[PDB]
């Protein structure tokens, strides 16, 4: 429980990549797709750390930030989330709703399916 | 590309229901579930107008506000939106994280099974 934006989740997506990034990676990274300033990036940082969402160690001079939640399980509150709002139909509405709509790959479609039949 | 809150969601799906409807009929179909005021209710119906998801036809004197969106490429597209957000393995990722958490019975897995094939 309780949200965070857009803009954090960029920054979450890219420690839950390389598990520990500096503030400089995280620039660096982001600023591939969008034009933000450093500046507005490491408030970013900042207010994830204050909040509590991630901490941070110290390799070398330079400090390494790193998650202090559960990736599987804050985008999962979150679909719940997402699908409550727009698809009052549940799960099923959005997965009918976008295999209707998204021209899948025979390879898509098969991945989706033992991905079924893993339990 | 507009972001529609979750009040809009409300309102836009009375609408698809429906397909034309005064700012009364939604009014009263809201407040049903809500405790939004009136002025309220109207707020959102005039954000829709100018942000061109809905309009209206002026039947009687009365405005019959209908949709301008496609309801299914309209959430398509939403749902697009929040995986790029959100999940960095498309849709796929998604739906791998929804059933390790969701305990979804065969019952309900074999429904979705069927979605998939037909």
Request: aromatic share 12%.
């Amino acid at each position: 429980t309780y949200e965070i934006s857009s803009a954090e989740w960029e920054v979450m997506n890219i420690i839950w990549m390389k598990k520990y990034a500096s503030a400089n990676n995280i620039i660096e990274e982001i600023q591939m797709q969008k034009d933000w300033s450093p500046k507005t990036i490491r408030t970013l940082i900042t207010r994830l750390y204050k909040k509590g969402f991630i901490d941070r160690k110290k390799d070398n001079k330079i400090f390494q930030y790193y998650s202090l939640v559960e990736e599987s399980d804050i985008k999962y509150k979150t679909s719940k989330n997402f699908i409550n709002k727009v698809y009052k139909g549940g799960f099923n509405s959005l997965v009918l709703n976008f295999v209707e709509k998204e021209e899948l790959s025979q390879d898509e479609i098969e991945e989706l399916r033992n991905i079924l039949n893993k339990k």
